[model samples]
Target chain A: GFPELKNDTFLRAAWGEETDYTPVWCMRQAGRYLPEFRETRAAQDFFSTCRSPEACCELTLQPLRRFPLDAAIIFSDILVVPQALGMEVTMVPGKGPSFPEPLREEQDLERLRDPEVVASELGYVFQAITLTRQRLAGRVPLIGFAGAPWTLMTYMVEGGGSSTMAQAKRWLYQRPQASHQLLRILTDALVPYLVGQVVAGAQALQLFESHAGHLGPQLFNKFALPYIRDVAKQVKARLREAGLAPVPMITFAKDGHFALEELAQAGYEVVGLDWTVAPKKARECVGKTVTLQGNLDPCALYASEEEIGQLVKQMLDDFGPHRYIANLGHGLYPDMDPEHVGAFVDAVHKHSRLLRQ
Target chain B: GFPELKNDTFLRAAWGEETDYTPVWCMRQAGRYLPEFRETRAAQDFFSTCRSPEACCELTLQPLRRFPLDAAIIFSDILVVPQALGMEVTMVPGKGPSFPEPLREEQDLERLRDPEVVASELGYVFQAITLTRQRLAGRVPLIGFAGAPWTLMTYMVEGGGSSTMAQAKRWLYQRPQASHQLLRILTDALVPYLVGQVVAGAQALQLFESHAGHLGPQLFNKFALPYIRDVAKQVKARLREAGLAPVPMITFAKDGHFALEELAQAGYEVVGLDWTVAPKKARECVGKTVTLQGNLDPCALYASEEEIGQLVKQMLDDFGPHRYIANLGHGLYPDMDPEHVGAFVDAVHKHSRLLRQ
Candidate 1:
């Protein structure tokens, strides 16, 4: 069993419960931004490091060592889910993720393994979660995340990161049936994988719909929202059946400002906000139904520590103290200064406490 | 002098007049989606094609041959503004624009040409516009455009397209004085360039803050919005001083859903929308101050022509007919079917006309 979570502030915020201070965490909190992480990760390739539970735990703890983060997301890649489905993915040093043989046509679906077996294939991630939770020793809650079905499908079909996601969107337009089938397959795998993460000791979960901005309301409502709604519904139902208390689930759809109202109703305990949407506008759309997390521009960390503190205070004022969590609108960049990141964490902790006082 | 105007539906819509129907034109309408464009572009490199006034005129006319478009945007590239500012840019086939010596530090600012003289260096562009307008023979209005200062700054500093404009934002955060200087220089260059475009026979202009989504409201207001407003104000003032009839200036900040109100006050007749923002919500933010020029998913073209018609009808219904000009949210992709582009244009015309009746 994992150590008892001493800090449940993130979970408390997720559930829209009162907290002493707004919980704060960065999306890629444990990343190469820290020299120590880069040094630790120097010995192995990207996936190999991810495969080792000890390495994952070490990386996850590295950030917590330097900052008082409220949560520790398991150190793993979103692309891992697609890899488990029998796709070959490679990390090309500086080039990021690549799938040599991306799904091109409907028949390519036959090449994938059955969705039910994917969790079995992704045991390393569960091991990482369990080990990370143990090493964390209740310092903070552990967050388990998967790329939302549509986001994962983008990587699977686009074969890598894309500005336009033209190829994948092409799949949606030209091959709607197949696109739906692929999204369904990803969702099926993700449900068990996420549940297994909780079983392995994840205290909270986040579904990263990172590519949600690419689709307009019509496509998202038709293709993405169905699966987004279904994932939360089935995840909670299964957790109930397993006798596991449902952890707070947060849906962070980067650039998905248009769907805040819809996402609030889609079974999430908290709806993550990206930097673009103003806090007041976001609150208006979601109303008081769910907690709000995130939305500082990540690049704001590049400012002086004093400037960052001022920004954090304004951001807090806008979101208010209750039913909120503090975070950058996106993942921290690798080239970011570790000291600046520390400044961000301290500002959130300091400002949220001050706001409550 | 150019021939007398035949169609001014787009201009009328921009000025918020009740039009017979919503005028439809696309961003990058004269682009690689057409086989003729690719064929004509086969020999010359991308910039060379832009530099050749004859080639630019031919490309501008190519799209009109296929669709009953309401306007013709001069064929060009956003990078030319930077190119004239003394950056050595190359088109690497599929890789896109590359600035060999991008501005990385404050000292690098000295490498740029004097902003006042940038218009003289961009004579080829003015030539292209004049030729493009003259050749159009008043079949449709000619729209000219420039990259808004911040977007041009990103390509100038980041050396190319970046998903996150880390280096440029660093300039804004770390070297505020220098960033303002650079933006000011860019605005100076843009004003003369835009004024000259109008003098050379442009009937309309669009200022493209193509990278607005990368910045949150604070930075955009500080760094981008000031220059966006300045460009419009200066160009209009200069046009009026010259005794030229003022053209409707459209500001298309691709993902600036958050800044709609500020942009409406930023002195543009039309505000362009990317697909991510719903039409009704955008209407709420911008109010009735200006016309809304776009908000359709460019990827929707992959759907059946019948489906595209339905989509356009819905988009028209959401936007309503009074103050709208039909266009895709973004540029036409290289691989998009030319026929589909026509379907989009025709759908807007058909549906918008039907909506009016």
Candidate 2:
């Protein structure tokens, strides 16, 4: 039998098309907040589970078993690409990702050698994606995502997650030509990293441009957006050459509200917005052809179950469910209850149906 | 002879009328970012200097002495009202405002009962306004400002500045009546606080709703915007009864893009915007009625001198100098150079004339 279809409704809506209902998902849906997810994560160390294909596949499916989610994002870190590119990455307990030897000097760019060579070192991501897809079967569509080059460069430069990209910004603002060279190397590496996931049976791809919003419009156009556009362009071209149907791409640029118009004209089929971009204004700025995803402020989850239900209904009313794919404007905070998420998902279904009429 | 007929071209532009040239001021124009302001501040304790009318008045004129500024803002903290309303307030160097005893129970409401009686305790503010106006000697108009009711209430309830108004939001969402009671008391206190400054000699008032952007539209309309409207209305009513012309008020709700239409209708003569709300879009949303102030991102100062010059020029071109007041969307960082500010202020004049032509 043909591979059973997972939830295609979300993929359909993401590509600027129709869906049975508003397709909803959350970034980091399978995370520490959910009691069940915590139970599974506690069984083993984070990196041990993340690196092992079997363990990673199980963690990836943990969110889907309990919650009625539309898509299952592959459980992995964006830092994996850097690791595959020969950086030693470790996830610190209280803090976040750390590189034992961060790229502090100009010569650090030498670590990134060949894009084709990275596939061999990073083959586990493909293996894990294939394993997770085999397990998911027709249950739901699996989404594969990677960190945008600039965000990864920040972690690599600062040696961990930083509140302000002070070091990174200093570099970009001070040394434009050098930063662009680093960006170009990362761009070349990302093409293979993303294409591998599509080959591994992932149905869709998203580029998480987490720090893209930190720069103003001019810097964004110069340094951030072009690399993002280049990666998508290369990934899509590879898929076409391989005789596979081109996979839909979503670019989530959190807090980059000023760049939506330019982002729409970028090659991505959908532009993911953060909570700051109101849906009506996003629709106006992004225009109709490019599908819009996201923009519910995740903090709304802190409200009561009733408030969450009402908020979901309000979002559907504001942006019609037809061309809209629903998601949080940002990642869920580490404290949100999984049950509230379930209630929110259920509310999205009930409300979108009523509004569809 | 007649209040010296101080020319306030900013107020004129605020009323949708023409001016000889665009009036320019900086948010935190008198700040530690200026080396000269730091030297003056070094001679006095921070909070003590703010409380002393003479010292505060001196700080207000320091920026004007150094720059070719069009206005002087009264140097005072927005938290002064809590001190006047029987709360002991102190500034903890790096941590922000700290209350010796914060409002924790329903009985705290008793302190708010006599919001109208705060004039005597807050007499320093009135004196500072008067002293600063006298020092200006009619070189330019002296502008007075106060915290909007909701924002002051948040700090009061939380007992200090909050990263996220979690405790305040919980109280506001759960106990609406209690929150509204505090808002009303603040609204009453704020009217007199502002009027005292106007009567003392302030030519214009800016209500700083610094936390305005955090709330969704519903909460803002119910809690923040309405209280701001009440203060604006009462300030006008009291002034009219005293046989004085209504002083033009600028309501700067930082990050309040969603509420512009409501704010425009709220009777403020000018509306201040943050960097996120594009100037061209703001012109369309707010229209040509109320004067529009602000919105270059403070980080623009972090750019090189050349970039700073270009950005300041772009802001004027977008907003039009006739109705636009040149300023940063928010306060300058303490690390910013005094030279950068000089470059910025000079650019506003140089580019604004070019754009005007």
Candidate 3:
């Protein structure tokens, strides 16, 4: 079968080359934010769309059809790893994901730590990616993703999104030995999971470490950095060993300004940035090795279309197009207007190439 | 009346001089996080305690009784300026402050722009500060504070504590000219409000720009920085004209790590930092001209007592007792255990001196 058609313009931009125009995509591009996407989901449920490969195929292509977007991210949740590990996860309207049985004691880690069980349980995710790839037929590049181990551990240990991250940090600060043990388990699980996506026709992989800002520099180095590095190394090694071309890996440690240099040193070829860090400073910190994606304040899209264009121009001029991907620093708000998103994409594409010369 | 005690040990330590024991205080030292303070509020209510000078005096002293703290800040909310200007404000439990009529349209600027209305109506705040000073006698210095222009404008324009800040940024990015008009008005009113607090017997002052992190470096310089400099300049000039000794002004720009040096240049003698910045790195960035207050990750208190103690020791070692005031980088979470706070304060006093020597 021909390779799945997620747009390669984004991939070209991600590789630090000038494309026909600058590539643009929204973080969480396939989620419930767009009115048309939500309308599609009105008949069904979130997990149904996510788990059912055909529905996931339609959902994955929805954003690409609606906007002149550069890439098509697979319609799946990062927490699918946890679900694949046999933890019961469900999404409720007005409330976020709920886990019937979250990690409690070391005993609970028994079932989760087993890699064979995780691979067997979560193999369906690769099925979704493969199916989505087949349906896209090269319209855009299929981007596959997973939560960074630290972020998944936080949600798994805390049972949900926490305001203070008290429970998770306790294990980090006090029980460092135990926490690293858990991180190692996650690293082992994630390597195989990411590899399966690439094997199943994913064109690119992004590691979403959403809560990267929570750790201090010391804890970040000790816990987050090493695990991320290990995952990146193993994923690339496994692909090369299997005689397959390794897909480009992007590691997004959101809200992590202090750790950018460290992330650049990690094996990933691209670094995803959140809104808080300025691209100029980030470019300085990361140097010229890895391509940088994002740093736009997503809320800026709520303003007039002209304002969105200017904001896009400001980011492109500030960071330059030689090593950048035009995307929001964080996830798009579920309430944002889709037309404005299209405008933002067009603006990035039009303005960035103009500034490149 | 005897001249109000104005020997601010926190300020003295911040300028690179050793104080008797490190003068430590939490930012929200006198608020809802304390159970005793909650009981006092249960006797009255949040608004009554704030509005009545007598009750405000009583609640302000509650934390000092329980913890051997070195400061007693004026008990007030930042939104009092809006209330003083006749904008309806309410504090709903769990929801934070709410404004019945937020400044969304062009005409709403008229109400906010009038300086005479603010000075006349907000005089009660100064009255309360004077009453609290009269009540304190000589226990500890009284800290006077107001919201920074950008922060107050953020809440007023957005109507409350906003996560996305869509409305505020819309006003900022799309209509910079209009937003600056409102920001300038806030600056005009805040200058007198802060100066009046000092005149009413606040020994030192703090400007709380809690939402300063919203703007990236460029926008922060153009908008937030200049306005803050103006406020500092006015406060310093007013104190000189009054023939009162100039009080050390502290500017707490939360998450404005990229703007620390610029903030120091803004004429604030002391700069406050949030949890994301390491004290050692902050010292390197700002140098020793300005005093540095803050930056223990408040969530660090949630760890075991030993962990909290070690983290406190690390902070002391980083900043030394000579040029630092022991405090949390941000406000403590409401559910945080007060016993841990007791442990934190004790550790600062015990270990800081050793580290200094």
Chain B TM-score, all predictions listed: 0.99, 0.96, 0.95
Query: How much is the TM-score of the A chain of model 2?
Result: 0.96
| Ten-residue stretch with the least lDDT total in model 3 chain B | B1-10
lDDT digits (tens) for residues B293-316 of candidate 1: 887899999889999989888999
TM-score of chain A of 1: 0.99
Q: How many clashing residue pairs are found in candidate 2? A: 0
Those runs of model 2 whose alpha carbons end farther than 4 Å from true positions after fitting are: A1-3, A39-49, A52-55, A78-127, A150-174, A212-214, B1-7, B42-45, B83-90, B97-114, B117-119, B153-175
Question: Which CAPRI category fits model 2?
Answer: incorrect
Q: Write the per-residue lDDT of candidate 2 for residues A1-357, one digit (tens) a residue.
A: 226885688878877777668878899887888776677667666676777898778878887887788898998888887887778876767756788788767778887667568777778888899999898886878899899988888887878765346667666766667788888878888898889899998889999988865565766887898999999999999999998877889999876777899999999998998776678888998888888887776767766789889988888787876578888887776677788888878888888888876
Q: What shift in Å separates residue A266 of candidate 2 from its native position after superposition?
A: 1.6
State how far residue B322 of model 1 sits from its true place (Å).
0.2
Q: Quantify all predictions' global Cα lDDT against the true fold.
A: 0.91, 0.81, 0.81
Put down candidate 1 lDDT per residue, A48-143, tens digits, no spaces: 988999999999999999999999899899999999999998788878899999998999999999999999999999998888888888999999
Score candidate 1 by lDDT: 0.91
Q: Report how far off residue B178 is in candidate 1 (Å).
A: 0.5
Candidate 3 ranges beyond 4 A from true positions? A4-9, A12-21, A99-115, A157-159, A174-178, B3-7, B14-21, B108-113, B320-322
Alpha-carbon runs more than 4 Å astray in model 1: none
